[PDB]
Amino acid sequence: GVRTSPTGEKVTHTGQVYDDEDYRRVRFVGRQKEVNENFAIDLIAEQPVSQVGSRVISCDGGGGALGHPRVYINLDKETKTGTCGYCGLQFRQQH
Amino acid sequence: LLKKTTGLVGLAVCETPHERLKILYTKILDVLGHIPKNAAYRKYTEQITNEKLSIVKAEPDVKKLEEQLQGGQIEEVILQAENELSLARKMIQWKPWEPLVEEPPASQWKWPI
Amino acid sequence: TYKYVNLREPSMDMKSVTDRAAQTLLWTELIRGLGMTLSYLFREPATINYPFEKGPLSPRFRGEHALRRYPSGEERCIACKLCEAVCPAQAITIEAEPRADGSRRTTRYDIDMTKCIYCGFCQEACPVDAIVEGPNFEFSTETHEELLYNKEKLLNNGDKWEAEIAANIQADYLYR
Amino acid sequence: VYDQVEFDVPIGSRGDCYDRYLCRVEEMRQSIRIISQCLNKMPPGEIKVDDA
Amino acid sequence: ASATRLIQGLRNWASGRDLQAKLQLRYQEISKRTQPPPKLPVGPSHRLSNNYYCARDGRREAMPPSIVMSSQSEKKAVSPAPPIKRWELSQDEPYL
Amino acid sequence: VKQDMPPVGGYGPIDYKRNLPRRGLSGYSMFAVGIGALLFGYW
Amino acid sequence: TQLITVDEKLDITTLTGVPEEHIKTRKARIFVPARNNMQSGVNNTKKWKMEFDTRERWENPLMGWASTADPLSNLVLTFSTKEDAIAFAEKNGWSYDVEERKVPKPKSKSYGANFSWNKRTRVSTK
Amino acid sequence: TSVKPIFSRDMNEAKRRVRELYRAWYREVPNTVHLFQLDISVKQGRDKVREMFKKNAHVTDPRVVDLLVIKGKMELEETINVWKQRTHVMRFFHETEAPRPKDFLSKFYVGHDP
Amino acid sequence: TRPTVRPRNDVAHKQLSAFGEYVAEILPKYVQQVQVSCFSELEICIHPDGVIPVLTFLRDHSNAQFKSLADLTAVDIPTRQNRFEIVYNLLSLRFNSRIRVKTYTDELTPVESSVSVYKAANWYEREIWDMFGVFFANHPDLRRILTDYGFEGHPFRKDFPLSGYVELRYDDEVKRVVAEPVELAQEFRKFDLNSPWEAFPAYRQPPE
Amino acid sequence: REKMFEFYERVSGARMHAAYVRPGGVHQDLPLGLMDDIYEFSKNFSLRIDEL
C-alpha cells in the first residue's frame, strides 16, 4: 500500500519521504527512489485469524527450524486476539 | 669413521672431537673457577660440565658419544661448549649472583589489572 | 620421520658420466620440458565460457545480502540487532520502533557493502533467518554509494532472490 | 591430531633456494600423504565443542 | 576425455605419463550437486542425566598461574624438558 | 545418523612419491645416434 | 653514577603525537561508572574509567549515519585506582575532573522484620 | 627521581643535541626544496623548521628532549634519503586545511567546539 | 571432565616449574618473578637492566639453549607507572621447549637492544619503537617500520584512538595526496559488552 | 588451486576467507560428497606435482 507525497515522491513502509524544500531530493533527479511495494503491515493483515480450541497456542512461524523461536501465546482475553511476537500471525480461542 | 658431513649448513666436521671437547671443558672449568663458590651458576655449570667431561672420557667411539651426550651431532656439542665458555666469560663480568638490584612496584606484575 | 632432499652422491663410472655429459651436450631435460609443454598443448583446456558458463558454487555461498520474509509476506526481521552486534566490520546500522500495529520492526536496516567482509556472521547470528547472505555475486556498481544498501534495497533483494534463497537454506539448514 | 598422522619432514643439505624449493615440493607430497590419512581416519561425531 | 586416440597417444608420449588414468578435468566421477539431507549427531553432553555443567565447566577450571618465585643442597641442574630425541630417517623414502 | 564419512573399506591408495619415469636412451646410444647422423650427412 | 635526577613534572605531550586541540581543550572524566539499574551485578563498578567530553555527532547527508570529528569519542581507559588515572591524565596534559567512588552503604536486613508485632515494617503480603 | 637517561646527563648536553639537530635541518632545507621540487622558498621551509623547533621549546626534561632529538633525526633521515615523497614533506604545511576560528565569536558562529 | 575440557599436562608443569626455579636461582640479580600458567607456559619476569644478561644466558646455557627468538612484543597497560611490558618469546629446539621473558619500561626509560643476543630482534623492537614508542638503546637502525613516514604518535598505545588523528585524500588543487584531521562519515560505534556478573571466581581480586 | 578453493567454498561458503576453523571446533559440518571429491583431487594431484 505505497502512497505518494504532494512532491510525487513515494512514501516507504516506514513513512519516510523528504520535504518539498529539502535539497536531498536532488539525489533522485534523473534516477529513481527504490522503495519496496510489499508492505508487511498490510500483508500480515491479509492473514486470517486462526481459530483454535486450545487455551495456549504455540507458534514457530511454520517450517520448524526454518521459522522463529517457538513461543506460547495465551488466549484468555476474548476482546484481543493472540498475536505472535515474531511473525505477526494472530490466534483466537474458538470458545 | 670420518663422518662425511654434519648435515647442518656452516657446521663443518670436527676431525678430533674428543680432544676438542676435553680442551673446551677444561677451559670452561678453568674460567668457571673465577666465579665464587656460593653462586648457583658455578655449581650447576661445574655439575653439567663434569658430567659431560666424564662421558667424553668414558667413550672412545664418536657415534656412541653422540647418543649418550644427548645433544645431536658431536660438532654442535662442540659449538655448545664454545657458547658455554663465552657465556661464562660474560657471567664473570656481569656478576649476576648478586642480590636483586631493584624491586618492581607494588602492582607491576598484577594481571589482570 | 624425515628425509634428505638433494643428498644424492652421483656415480663416477663411465656409464653415468657419459649419461650426464650426453644430457649436457644433447639437452635431455630441456627436451623433457618441451615434451611436457607439448603435452599440455594437446589437452582440452579448463576454460569455461563465461558469461554463458558459470563457475560451480555450493548452497553455502556467501554473496549479496537480503532481508527475508515469512511465507505470508511478513518480514522476518524483529529488530533485535544481533547481526550488528556480531558484525566484525560494523557494516550493519539498525534503528527500530514499534510500527502501527505494535510489531517490533526496523525503520533503518543499512548494510554498507563496502565495509562488509562477506563472512556471514549476520545470517548465522540471526535467530529468525531474516538477514541472509544470498547467492548473488554479480552486483558490481559504477558508483560507491550504490553499494550502501538501505532496508528497501535489501528487502528488494529478498523479494528478488527468495525463490533461490529458500532453496539454498532448505539444502543447507540441517548443517546449521 | 598431528601425532596420529604419519608423514616425513624434508630436510635440505645446502641452505639455498634449490633445497628450499625441493622442501616445498616434498611438503606438497607429504600433505597429500596426510590428506589420505585424514580421509581414511575421519571419525563421526560433533564438530563444535559441546560447551554451549 | 573426448580426445581421439592419435592425439591421446601423442599427448601420453610427450608427457611421459599415462594421462588418461588421472585427468585434471572433472567428469561424472565427482559427487552429485544435490545431496540427501544429513542427520548430524549430537555431542556427548546431550544427555538428560549426570550432565551437570559444574562437572564439565572448562573455563572455570582455569586457574591463575602458579607463582614459582616472587620477590614479595647439592641438587641437580635441570633443563626445561628432557632433550629432544634424534629423528629417525624415513623407512618410506629417505632419498638414500 | 547421516554424516560425511569415508566408505566401509575406506578409500583406495593415493600415490604421493616422485614419479619421474626415466625415459630416453643411454648416453652411449645418444652419442651413437648423433655420430651416425653426422656420418650420414658427411657421406 | 649512571642515573640522572629529573625533579621536573612528568609531561609527555610533545611525544604522543596528539594535536594541541585534543590536549588543551579536552576534559577527561575520571570516574567509577555506575551500576546499570537494569541489573544487579556489580562487576562493572570495580575499576576506574577515564573518558572524555562528548563532541558533536551530526547526521550523514547520504545515509543518516552518525558522523563525528572527535577522534577521542570512543577512547575509554581502564585504571585500577583513582591515583593511577590521575597520574595518567596529568602525564598527558589532559585537564580532568574526578568523581569519587560511590559504594552503596551497608543495609540492615531482617527477614523477621517483615512480620513484626508493633512496627510499621510488616509486609502486607508476601 | 633518580632515572636512567637516554643520551644526556642534564639539560646542557640536551640543548647541545637540539642545537646540532637544528644545524643539520638548517643545512638540509635547500637540498629538500631542490630534490623534492617543492613550491615553497628556502626561507619558508627554514621558517617551518624554526616553528617546529619553537613548538617544543617549553620542555625542561632531558629525556623528553632527547626523544625529540631522536625523532627529529629520524625525520631528517627520512628526508635526506628519499623515503618521504613530496607529500610527506608538504604535510608540515597544512595547505588544504581552511584556517580555524581563533577568537570566541567565530568559534561560537561555526559550532560547539571550545 | 573428559570430552569438552582441555587435558592438564602435569609433567610439563613440573618440568617448567623446576627450570623456573633453576633460572631464578642462577640469576637472582634480575629475576623478579617466575610463574607457570595452568596451560604450562613459563614466564620469567625480570628487571629491565638485565635484558641482555638473562637472554644471553638462556640462549647460551647448556641446560637452556633458547637459540630461537620466536616473538618480541610490547603491551601497553596504562594503569601501571611502567606502562609498557616487553615480552620475549623464546624457543629451545634442543629441549623442545618455550620460555617467556617479561620486563617493563615507561615512555622515557630506554631498554637495551637485544640484537647482540638475537639479530631477529632487529626489526621486532624496531616495531616496538613504531607502535609503542619504547626506545631501544644501542640499536643498529632504529626508525619506523610500519607507519607512514610523517606519522605522529605511536598507534598501539591505548590512549591513541582507533582511527588516527589524520586521514589522507588526493587534492587536485595542490595536485598532491594530503593529510587532514580525521572526520568519519559514520563513527565507530562503541559497544559496552562486559557483563556485570563475575565470570571467573578464581581470578577474583580482593577488595579495598 | 581453483579446485581447492571450490573445496573451501563447499565447506564454508567463501573461497578464501572462510571463517570456518573457530575457537571450539569448526563452524559447520562437512557437506555430503565433499570427502569423496577431496579423494578425487588427491588421487590426481601427485601427477600435477610430478609434471611441475
Ligand code: SF4
Ligand atoms: S536481521 Fe536478524 S539478527 Fe538482525 S536485527 Fe533483524 S532479526 Fe535481529
Ligand code: SF4
Ligand atoms: S557478512 Fe559479516 S561483515 Fe557482512 S554484514 Fe554480515 S556480519 Fe557484517
Ligand SMILES: [Zn+2]
Ligand atoms: Zn510466530
